[PDB]
């Protein structure tokens, strides 16, 4: 059995291209960005970048532009995905219903043809007549824009030039005219063609071919005032227009090559060009008029503006601001100031959209030190690599829950706090000051206060009853101090106010139209807030007077007037929680009392009965229920808050354990002010991100709990100059470290570079778990690339060791030949080496097997034993592989990967000592990631954005038949998966109580998606696949694209449909449709629970199932 469920915890956030136009309406600009498949449209406004819609398409969006045909007000959008599917989208809005309609959908994949090396290029005629696609090598797809072509019937034109490096459109031509730069054995040339749809061929072209430089990157289309084409490449900027060949070689563009570009001035008087290193160059077009009417170009200029993120998208929105889109870094909203500043650069950032980027590795750690797991990844690359931390959630002690002012709020009453007193100051905004005034008593300090009825408020003061207000204006019912008893385990509500003044007391509910004598019987149980909490604001009758008491916790429900006598069950519970929480959706009220003494009662309150509940026995301390309320929406519930950390989700009668974003909650609740959405009230978007910038690209990360440290491999790129050996480029975290160390391997001593060469130096950084500051940065040797890291316990040695494998790399050789396996110990402050163990090869990935160690030398799986004399000794070898890249272990099973071969599961032989080959997969896969799910299922992630799971079938005969593993399940994730890990964001225990999560596995991809993979049962999988197929039949796709077509396995040669893999966004879209759509689906479903009983297909019964499925999300 291997039936897997895959879901997406966090959406991808790596920008793949940007457009700007009047998409939503003809009066506002837009910013449309499609990260990997998720397409978000932002409407440009004064408040910032307000999102208006995000959609999920079944395909990796690759070609994106906006075109405005004649006869249409708002311009349509053309989308081409990585599965060769073309869609034309239009923004349709009717008052509030926002939807995107597909005016023309089609499939443009050709059975024959080689895919292009650059990728996929889409071009639009400036007058919006036809669509040009550079899909396959040697072909040029052309789609007419005639409205009868709803099915997108295109035609392919054959051109003589095969290796076309770029193709774009021209300007000012009556007929559709394109220009392309191409590579031939004679060099790189630029040629123009006049494409005509009437003859369906290519004409001669406006101007002849011109020999451009050997490194022409891409072409820029200059608008009508100047026309022609712009060719930018490494060390060259040229302008070609008929008889004009104005070319310059600026000395500033020499460092790197331009990647992205955009046009700012509508007439074409200014351009922005990106760079590989993040520099944002600007291109100036100097114009001049000759005689009358004719305008030509004077000269070209380039200028450096500043440094930005790693530029893959550049767009100019409005008012001198630029959207800097990034693939390996966070996106930026930079501002182009007219005047410069210090360290002169006209680029100043305004907003930073977080991007997970190329997640290389990840690991699960426990900062809380309880036993649960939080993710930490080595995000980013090049100069902007960081250490972003992903977690689950949603000395400032004490809050202001008094939302007295309906709109002004801020701070009007300084309600300051100590033991059994009252500090209430009149404030003007958040101005708080330690200027004690004698007008109001200030030696007192408040816990709580309340209102009674008809705003006959009470000025609680020991001196005199001086009501500073206009409504009551009387000395009636001041909160007296019979024994100097201020709020000391005391409280009051608002609908009714029951106090305990001394011991004999006339019920203080004597207010205008609020008269009652119920708490007149002598109460022997003085409660903090002895009262009832109504079901809304009902008063004057007795709809539900049954509340109960928690002093003895009896089945009898004690109403307030009774106060009877029962068995003396005064338990040890006296510790106070924070609150019990008003939290439900529309109409369901429950009573999850905080009975943390034992048998935590998460009552699913049946109002009438309230008998029992699903009890989760969490044996914690002495914590009874404490009544407290803060209100945010139409909510009526409470919350069990026992001693050992318990943070819950809102459910019917069950519970989960999670984290609140605040790291300390004694008397805490955040604000409701909606002023700053970027800087939220998150003290320290369901998953929260904490960013620690290292200013250098990390490679591998591991955690040690004995010293509570993070060991991270990192690579720093420095320009190598002969004057001084090597000079740094930017100050990274390695240079700005508290300590430093340089490796010294005397036995392993074994070229020269130029002044313009660059050197990648690999370092190991030790980072504290609390402050996340670098402590020690051990620097490796020259031409030393480090490719592994593991903190492990070896043999009988009580110490834990950081083991790093590394290899020499020289520009001459293609494969490393010599390497080493270095062992470090972190005693205090300094990393001390122990052993070197020089190995002729290249270490790739190392995992602690069973107290010994296993290596991943090229074409070699070796076992090393940590002897008593502190050195590694070889134990056994296995050479039946090309070279083992990624390796995972579980028990006695060693899942060995290969870059072009397949799963190579090996079994250790304790009696023999050498490895054996139980089975091996015999298919070509081009593997990229390996994981072992269970004792039988082995899962892998590919280089062509694919997922698969194979099994070691035990039904085969006692022969070579069992030596084969068949691909049980296949899936097309559509993303380049990079790392697999074990854990979950939910509290990681007690998940076997019929919950459909049999083993949770995280995966992190290159584009920055966190994903969950779990296992189900056979009946669960069959029901779930059937319901998914029914929903796919019922629901309408965003771009008229089939879900099964998109999820089907698709390599370069095989296109078998996806089997044995339940999808994640389609399953969770069931909760995002209207009730008639719930009735359209599940109309004749079975909903098999046992074998054949209870076949009714209740919509709520499937809603509960989907909720249980999305609990692990």
């Amino acid at each position: 059995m291997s039936y897997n469920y895959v879901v997406t915890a966090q959406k991808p956030t790596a920008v793949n291209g940007c457009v700007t136009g009047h998409f939503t309406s003809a009066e506002d600009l837009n910013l449309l960005i499609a990260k990997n498949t998720r397409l978000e449209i932002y409407v440009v406004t004064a408040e910032g970048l307000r999102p208006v819609k995000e959609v999920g398409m079944y395909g990796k969006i690759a070609v994106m532009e906006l075109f405005r045909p004649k006869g249409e007000s708002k311009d349509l959008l053309f989308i081409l995905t990585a599965k060769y599917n073309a869609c034309i989208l239009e923004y349709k809005q009717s008052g509030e219903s926002i939807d995107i309609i597909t005016r023309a959908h089609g499939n443009v994949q050709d059975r024959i043809g080689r895919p292009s090396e650059t990728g996929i290029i889409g071009i639009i005629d400036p007058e919006c007549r036809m669509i040009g696609l550079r899909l396959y090598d040697g072909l040029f797809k052309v789609i007419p824009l005639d409205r009868d072509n709803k099915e997108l019937k295109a035609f392919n034109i054959r051109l003589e030039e095969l290796h076309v490096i770029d193709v774009k459109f021209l300007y000012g031509c009556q007929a559709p005219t394109i220009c392309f730069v191409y590579q031939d054995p004679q060099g790189r040339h630029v040629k123009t063609y006049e494409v005509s749809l009437r003859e369906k061929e290519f004409n001669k072209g406006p101007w002849k071919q011109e020999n451009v430089e050997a490194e022409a990157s891409m072409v820029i289309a200059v608008p009508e005032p100047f026309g022609g084409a712009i060719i930018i490449g490494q060390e060259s900027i040229t302008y070609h227009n008929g008889d004009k060949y104005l070319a310059i070689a600026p000395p500033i563009i020499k460092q790197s090559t331009i990647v992205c570009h955009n046009r700012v001035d509508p007439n074409g008087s200014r351009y922005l060009l990106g760079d590989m290193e993040g520099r944002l160059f600007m291109l100036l077009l100097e114009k001049e008029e000759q005689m009358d009417g004719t305008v030509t170009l004077k000269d070209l200029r380039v200028e450096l503006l500043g440094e930005t993120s790693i530029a893959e998208c550049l767009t100019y929105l409005d008012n001198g601001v630029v959207f800097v889109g990034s693939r390996l870094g966070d996106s930026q909203l930079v501002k182009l100031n007219v005047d410069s500043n210090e360290q002169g650069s006209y680029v100043v950032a305004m907003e930073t959209f977080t991007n997970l980027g190329p997640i290389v590795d990840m690991c699960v750690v426990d900062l809380e030190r309880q036993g649960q797991g939080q993710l930490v990844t080595c995000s980013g690359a090049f100069k902007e690599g960081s250490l972003r931390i992903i977690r689950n959630g949603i000395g400032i002690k004490g809050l202001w829950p008094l939302r007295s002012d309906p709109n002004r709020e801020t701070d009007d009453t300084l309600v300051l706090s100590f033991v059994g007193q009252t500090r209430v100051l009149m404030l003007n905004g958040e101005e708080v000051e330690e200027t004690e005034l004698m007008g109001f008593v200030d030696d007192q300090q408040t816990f709580f206060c309340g209102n009674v009825a008809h705003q006959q408020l009470i000025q609680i003061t020991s001196a005199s009853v001086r009501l500073v207000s206009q409504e009551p204006k009387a000395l009636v019912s001041e909160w007296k101090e019979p024994q100097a008893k201020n709020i000391s385990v005391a409280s009051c509500n608002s609908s009714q106010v029951v106090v305990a003044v001394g011991r004999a007391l006339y019920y203080l509910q004597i207010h205008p139209q609020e008269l009652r004598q119920i708490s007149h019987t002598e109460m022997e149980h003085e409660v903090a807030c002895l009262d009832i909490t109504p079901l809304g604001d009902s008063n004057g009758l007795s709809p539900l007077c049954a509340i109960g008491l928690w002093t003895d916790i009896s089945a009898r429900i004690l109403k307030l007037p009774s106060f009877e006598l029962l068995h003396k069950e005064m338990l040890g519970g006296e510790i106070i929680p924070r609150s019990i929480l008003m939290t439900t959706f529309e109409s369901s009220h429950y009573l999850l009392c905080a009975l943390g003494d034992g048998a935590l009662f998460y009552f699913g309150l049946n109002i009438e009965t309230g008998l029992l509940s699903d009890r989760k026995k969490v044996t914690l301390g002495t914590q009874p229920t404490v009544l407290r309320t803060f209100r945010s929406l139409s909510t009526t519930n409470v919350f069990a808050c026992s001693d050992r950390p318990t943070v819950i989700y809102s459910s019917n009668h069950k519970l989960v354990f999670s984290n609140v974003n605040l790291k300390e909650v004694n008397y805490m609740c955040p604000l409701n002010s909606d002023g700053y959405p970027d800087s939220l009230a998150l003290a320290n978007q369901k998953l929260h991100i904490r960013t620690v910038p290292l200013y250098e690209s990390p490679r591998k990360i591991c955690y040690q709990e004995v010293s509570q440290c993070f060991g991270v491999l990192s690579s720093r790129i420095e320009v190598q100059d002969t004057s001084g050996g090597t000079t740094a480029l930017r100050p990274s975290a390695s240079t700005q470290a508290l300590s430093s160390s340089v490796s010294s391997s005397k036995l392993f001593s074994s070229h020269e570079t130029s002044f313009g060469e660059e050197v990648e130096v690999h370092n190991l950084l030790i980072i504290d778990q609390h402050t996340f500051e670098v402590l020690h940065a051990h620097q490796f040797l020259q031409n030393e690339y480090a490719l592994s890291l593991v903190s492990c316990k070896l043999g009988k040695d009580p110490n834990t060791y950081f083991i790093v494998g590394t290899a020499m790399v020289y520009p001459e050789e293609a494969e490393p030949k010599q390497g080493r396996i270095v062992v470090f110990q972190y005693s205090d402050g300094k990393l001390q080496t122990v052993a070197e163990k020089e190995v002729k090869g290249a270490v790739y990935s190392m995992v602690e097997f069973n107290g010994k160690l296993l290596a991943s030398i090229n074409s070699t799986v070796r076992l090393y034993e940590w002897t008593t004399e502190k050195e590694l000794r070889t134990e056994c070898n296995h050479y039946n592989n090309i070279m083992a890249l990624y390796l995972k272990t579980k028990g006695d099973f060693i899942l060995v990967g290969d870059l072009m071969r397949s799963v190579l599961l090996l079994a250790y032989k304790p009696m023999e000592g050498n490895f054996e080959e139980i089975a091996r997969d015999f298919n070509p896969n081009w593997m990229s990631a390996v994981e072992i799910l269970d004792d039988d299922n082995f899962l892998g992630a590919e280089n062509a954005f694919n997922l698969f799971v194979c099994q070691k079938d035990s039904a085969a005969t006692t022969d070579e038949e069992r030596q084969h593993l068949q691909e049980v399940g296949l899936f097309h994730l559509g993303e380049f998966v990079n790392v697999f890990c074990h854990g979950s964001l939910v509290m990681q225990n007690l998940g076997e109580t019929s919950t459909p999560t049999q083993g949770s596995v995280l995966f992190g991809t290159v584009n920055g998606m966190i994903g969950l993979v779990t296992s189900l049962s056979e009946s669960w999988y069959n029901l779930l696949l059937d319901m998914q197929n029914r929903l796919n039949k019922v629901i309408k796709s965003v771009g008229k694209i089939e879900h099964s077509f998109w999820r089907s396995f698709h390599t370069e040669r095989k296109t078998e449909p996806a089997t044995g893999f339940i999808d994640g966004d389609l399953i969770e879209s069931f909760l995002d449709i209207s009730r008639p759509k719930m009735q359209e689906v599940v109309a004749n479903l079975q909903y098999d629970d046992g074998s054949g009983m209870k076949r009714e297909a209740t919509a709520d019964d499937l809603i509960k199932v989907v909720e249980e499925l999305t609990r692990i999300h």
Partner: peptide, 19 residues
């Protein structure tokens, strides 16, 4: 005074002149 950054095209002034 410099022409490379001068007179950028603008919509209504209350577009990016707040917050």
């Amino acid at each position: 005074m410099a022409d490379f950054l001068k007179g950028l095209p603008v919509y209504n002034k209350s577009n990016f002149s707040r917050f």
